[PDB]
Write an enzyme that holds these catalytic residues in place. Structure first.
Site, PDB file in Angstrom:
ATOM      1  N   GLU A  85     -37.786  -4.466 -66.792  1.00  0.00           N
ATOM      2  CA  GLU A  85     -38.456  -4.258 -68.060  1.00  0.00           C
ATOM      3  C   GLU A  85     -37.490  -4.536 -69.232  1.00  0.00           C
ATOM      4  OE1 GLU A  85     -42.117  -3.092 -68.624  1.00  0.00           O
ATOM      5  OE2 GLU A  85     -41.155  -4.453 -70.024  1.00  0.00           O
ATOM      6  N   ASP A 113     -40.601  -2.524 -62.976  1.00  0.00           N
ATOM      7  CA  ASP A 113     -39.649  -2.087 -64.010  1.00  0.00           C
ATOM      8  C   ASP A 113     -38.163  -2.079 -63.656  1.00  0.00           C
ATOM      9  OD1 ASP A 113     -41.586  -1.759 -66.012  1.00  0.00           O
ATOM     10  OD2 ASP A 113     -42.261   0.080 -64.993  1.00  0.00           O
ATOM     11  N   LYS A 139     -52.129   2.616 -61.490  1.00  0.00           N
ATOM     12  CA  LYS A 139     -50.953   1.801 -61.168  1.00  0.00           C
ATOM     13  C   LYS A 139     -50.992   1.351 -59.723  1.00  0.00           C
ATOM     14  CE  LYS A 139     -47.985   1.571 -64.574  1.00  0.00           C
ATOM     15  NZ  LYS A 139     -48.037   0.495 -65.556  1.00  0.00           N
TER      16      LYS A 139
HETATM   17  O1  LIG Z   1     -45.810   0.651 -67.186  1.00  0.00           O
HETATM   18  C1  LIG Z   1     -45.911  -0.231 -68.242  1.00  0.00           C
HETATM   19  C2  LIG Z   1     -46.770  -0.036 -69.316  1.00  0.00           C
HETATM   20  C3  LIG Z   1     -46.756  -0.977 -70.333  1.00  0.00           C
HETATM   21  C4  LIG Z   1     -47.684  -0.722 -71.465  1.00  0.00           C
HETATM   22  C5  LIG Z   1     -49.051  -0.768 -71.243  1.00  0.00           C
HETATM   23  C6  LIG Z   1     -49.909  -0.512 -72.312  1.00  0.00           C
HETATM   24  C7  LIG Z   1     -49.400  -0.185 -73.567  1.00  0.00           C
HETATM   25  F1  LIG Z   1     -50.224   0.064 -74.588  1.00  0.00           F
HETATM   26  C8  LIG Z   1     -48.028  -0.118 -73.763  1.00  0.00           C
HETATM   27  C9  LIG Z   1     -47.157  -0.380 -72.708  1.00  0.00           C
HETATM   28  C10 LIG Z   1     -45.898  -2.080 -70.258  1.00  0.00           C
HETATM   29  C11 LIG Z   1     -45.786  -3.130 -71.312  1.00  0.00           C
HETATM   30  C12 LIG Z   1     -44.514  -3.457 -71.786  1.00  0.00           C
HETATM   31  C13 LIG Z   1     -44.329  -4.428 -72.777  1.00  0.00           C
HETATM   32  C14 LIG Z   1     -45.443  -5.070 -73.290  1.00  0.00           C
HETATM   33  F2  LIG Z   1     -45.317  -6.016 -74.236  1.00  0.00           F
HETATM   34  C15 LIG Z   1     -46.707  -4.745 -72.812  1.00  0.00           C
HETATM   35  C16 LIG Z   1     -46.902  -3.784 -71.835  1.00  0.00           C
HETATM   36  N1  LIG Z   1     -45.079  -2.210 -69.209  1.00  0.00           N
HETATM   37  C17 LIG Z   1     -45.088  -1.341 -68.224  1.00  0.00           C
HETATM   38  O2  LIG Z   1     -44.252  -1.455 -67.156  1.00  0.00           O
HETATM   39 MG   LIG Z   2     -43.015  -5.994 -69.633  1.00  0.00          MG
HETATM   40 MN   LIG Z   3     -44.035   0.490 -66.125  1.00  0.00          MN
HETATM   41 MN   LIG Z   4     -42.980  -3.122 -66.700  1.00  0.00          MN
END
Ligand SMILES: Oc1cc(-c2ccc(F)cc2)c(-c2ccc(F)cc2)nc1O
Ligand SMILES: [Mg+2]
Ligand SMILES: [Mn+2]
Ligand SMILES: [Mn+2]
Length: 202
Positions: A85, A113, A139
């Protein structure tokens, strides 16, 4: 109290490195941090948790796992976690494919991640404003794998992890929980929390 801006909160309460990485991630996926502001704060929060999960965890000379909480890790130590991530799409997959071709661990179909060199598995980190069980199942449903390990945190201190295997000691997880509580409390003081909580979808 007066209603604050989420922009202000994010810039005041997250490291500039985190904020910059979050902005870049939003740009890549086609959304504007100044418009989807609750999403912006969620991205920063999740990235920070990913970093905190990895922080201080090394593998020593003998090849087993230890914690060094001071910024002077001795040079023979290797980081226990690879962080996926925060990387852009191309670099993230480059890291994942590397790990996979090298370990035989089969390729995940979605970017995880972290990778854990002690437990030899990818990890998906969740951070949820809802109940941890529901978010865990969501998830998990993008994973028919069974190999990627899931670890969910909520802003109220609940956790859920695959096979009730929590990977980290209590103190490390408590640091994460304390930080989430702080984020929640500060958002609340600025009258941003209710909306941020309610805006989570799935
Ligand atoms: O577990 C996660 C959640 C998100 C995420 C999902 C929805 C949201 F509103 C905010 C975060 C993300 C994620 C990370 C960066 C991005 F540009 C988009 C989603 N990653 C992840 O690994
Ligand atoms: Mg991401
Ligand atoms: Mn995540
Ligand atoms: Mn992620």
């Amino acid at each position: 109290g007066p209603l604050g801006s989420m922009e202000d909160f994010v810039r005041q309460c997250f490291n500039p490195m985190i904020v910059e990485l979050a902005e870049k991630a939003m740009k890549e996926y086609g959304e504007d941090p100044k418009i989807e502001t609750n999403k912006f704060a969620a991205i920063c929060t999740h990235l920070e948790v990913c970093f905190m999960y990895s922080d201080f965890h090394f593998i020593d000379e003998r090849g087993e796992s230890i914690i060094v909480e001071s910024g002077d890790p001795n040079a023979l130590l290797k980081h226990r976690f690879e962080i996926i991530e925060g990387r852009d799409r191309i670099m993230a997959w480059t890291v994942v494919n590397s790990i996979c071709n090298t370990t035989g661990v089969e390729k995940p179909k979605f970017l995880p991640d972290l990778y854990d060199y002690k437990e030899n598995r990818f990890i998906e980190i969740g951070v949820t404003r809802r109940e941890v069980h529901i978010y865990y199942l969501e998830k998990a449903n993008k994973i028919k794998s069974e190999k990627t390990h899931i670890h969910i945190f909520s802003f109220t201190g609940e956790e859920m992890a695959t096979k009730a295997d929590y990977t980290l000691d209590e103190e490390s997880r408590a640091r994460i929980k304390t930080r989430l509580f702080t984020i929640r409390q500060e958002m609340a003081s600025r009258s941003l929390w209710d909306s941020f909580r309610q805006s989570e979808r799935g």
